[PDB]
Amino acid sequence: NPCEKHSCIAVIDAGSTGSRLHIYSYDTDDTNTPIHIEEIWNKKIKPGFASIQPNSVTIDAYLTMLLADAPIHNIPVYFYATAGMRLLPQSQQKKYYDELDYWFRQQSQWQLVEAKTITGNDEALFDWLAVNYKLDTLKSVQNKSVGVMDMGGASVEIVFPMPKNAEISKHNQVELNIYGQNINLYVHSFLGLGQTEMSHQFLNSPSCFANDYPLPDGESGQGNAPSCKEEVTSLMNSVHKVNQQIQPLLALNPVNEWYSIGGISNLASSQLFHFENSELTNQSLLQQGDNQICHQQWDILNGQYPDDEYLYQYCLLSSYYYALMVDGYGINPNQTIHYIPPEQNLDWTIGVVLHRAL
């Protein structure tokens, strides 16, 4: 039991597609800041918490499946929900939390500290802290700028260093002091631009699916990734104004190394795609989606990869990630984007260990 000799907390990432419990052990330095953070347990369940019916029976079944088999309990729990809950008004979210609070009050294995929906900006801060914790770039002043993108199912987050600025909304800027270093970040989350929510606007776009893929409207796919990418960009920019918000800031505050977490890791590591060194470029992701999915005959390709239930969307996703990173954020198509191997189950929850405010 590592929790006998080290501080332990549980952090739950309640994401739009699933919930992930992590138990972390850690020590603290001279300032009571965590160090030597180690994940001692994880459990992932689907579907997303916001997708279940908020009643006592269903909430119990879900929380039991997430938590009951954990080898360690009697520890503090932070239950932080993200874009899945943000899609609901507070009045509806409150029913989930009233039931979840009751569930925790009716048991003794877990000590609930907080259960709340965090903002996308809070999520983006955690994303940057988690990745930079893993990269060991927090202990000393970096002479490289590290930017983080979290490519979620309902929202996407972008976060990078930016000096404090009186012109930009306070909500989009965070100052923290960690390991005696003062860090100032720009944060932004785009609700609705996660892969699931985005996709619901393009299901009848023939350019976004393999040839003869059966579109729900009865037309056939006729894949073409550059054309699909142009359609997605209209959502990124004409609707959400991603380019106008993000590009001038990155021009002034270049990022030297980009890391991406979230579902893009699963796409990049899938059997259809081929990348070395756990990194990609937008140019190569768009070309590979174009040639290996968009330009293929759907029934033939589906039958080649029988077990693969994400495949059908890869023409669209490859196009969308390019639209978002290149046409939205302004990233060069040849710029390396590091992605974290999915096997690491790396989400933003280490950021909560490091940073207990919101």
Ligand X SMILES: Nc1ncnc2c1ncn2[C@@H]1O[C@H](COP(=O)(O)OP(=O)(O)NP(=O)(O)O)[C@@H](O)[C@H]1O
16: annotated binding-site residue? yes
The three-class DSSP label of residue 17 is: coil
Q: Is 154 in the site for a second copy (CB under 8 A)?
A: yes
Residue 81 engages a second copy in binding (rule: CB under 8 A): no
The interface region with a second copy, picked from 28-36, 176-184, 216-224, 262-270 by CB under 8 A, is 216-224
188 touches which of Cl ion, Mg ion, ligand X, none (CB within 5 to 8 A by kind)?
none
CB nearer to ligand X: give 147 or 263: 263
Structure tokens of 32?
Answer: 């009571």
Q: How far apart (Å, rounded) are the C-alpha atoms in residues 350 and 272? A: 31
Smallest distance from ligand X to CB 120, Å: 9
> Is position 196 annotated in a ligand binding site?
no
The binder of a second copy chosen from 12, 75, 86, 339 (CB under 8 A) = 86
Question: What DSSP element (H or E) covers 57?
Answer: helix 56-67
Which residues, including other chains, have CB under 8 Å from residue 131's CB and lie 6 or more apart?
146, 148, 259, 261, 340, 346
| Contact of 42 with 21, CB cutoff 8 Å | yes
**In this structure, what token pair is assigned to residue 268?**
């990049």
* Footprint of Mg ion on 11-50 (CB under 5 A): 15
* Contact set for a second copy, span 244-303 (CB under 8 A): none
| 177/234 with CB nearer a second copy | 234
Tell whether residue 152 is a contact of Mg ion (CB under 5 A): yes
User: Would the annotation count 17 as a binding residue?
Assistant: yes
Q: Is 46 annotated as a binding residue?
A: yes
Separation CA 6–CA 28 (nearest Å): 9
152 binding partner (options a second copy, Cl ion, Mg ion, none; Cβ < 5 to 8 Å by kind): Mg ion
Question: If contact means CB under 5 to 8 A according to the sort of partner, which of a second copy, Cl ion, ligand X, none does residue 290 touch?
Answer: none
Rule CB under 5 A: say whether 120 interacts with Cl ion. Answer: yes
**Dihedral, CA of residue 1, residue 133, residue 263 and residue 344, to nearest 10:** -40
Q: Residue 176: helix, strand or coil by DSSP?
A: strand
How many angstroms separate the first and last alpha carbons of the chain? 30
Question: Sign (positive/negative) of CA torsion 58, 59, 61, 66?
Answer: positive
Name which of ligand X, Mg ion, a second copy, none residue 278 binds, using a CB cut-off of 5 to 8 Å depending on partner kind: none
- At which residue do the structure tokens 């037309």 appear? 219
Distances (CA, A) of 248 to 41, 94, 251: 41, 38, 5
Any contact of residue 191 with Cl ion (CB under 5 A)?
yes
6 binds a second copy (CB under 8 A): no
# residues near Cl ion by CB under 5 A: 7
Q: Rg of the chain over CA atoms, in angstroms?
A: 21
Max distance between CA atoms of the chain, in angstroms, equals 65
Q: Which of 109, 234, 244, 344 touches a second copy (CB under 8 A)?
A: 234
Q: Is 209 labelled as part of a ligand binding site?
A: no
CA neighbor of 73 nearest in space, from 8, 6, 19: 8
Angle, helices 90-105/56-67, rounded to nearest 10 degrees: 60
Binding site as annotated, residues = 3, 16-17, 20, 44, 46, 104, 107, 110, 153, 234, 238, 266, 271, 310, 314
Q: Which residues bind a second copy (CB under 8 A)?
A: 47, 51, 53, 86-87, 89-92, 117, 119-121, 154, 169, 171, 189, 191-192, 197, 200-204, 214, 216-219, 231, 234-235, 238-240, 309, 312-313
Binding site as annotated, residues for AMP = 16-17, 20, 44, 46, 153, 266, 310, 314
Q: Which residues bind Cl ion (CB under 5 A)?
A: 86, 119-120, 189, 191, 216-217
Binding site as annotated, residues for Mg(2+) = 3, 104, 107, 110, 234, 238, 271
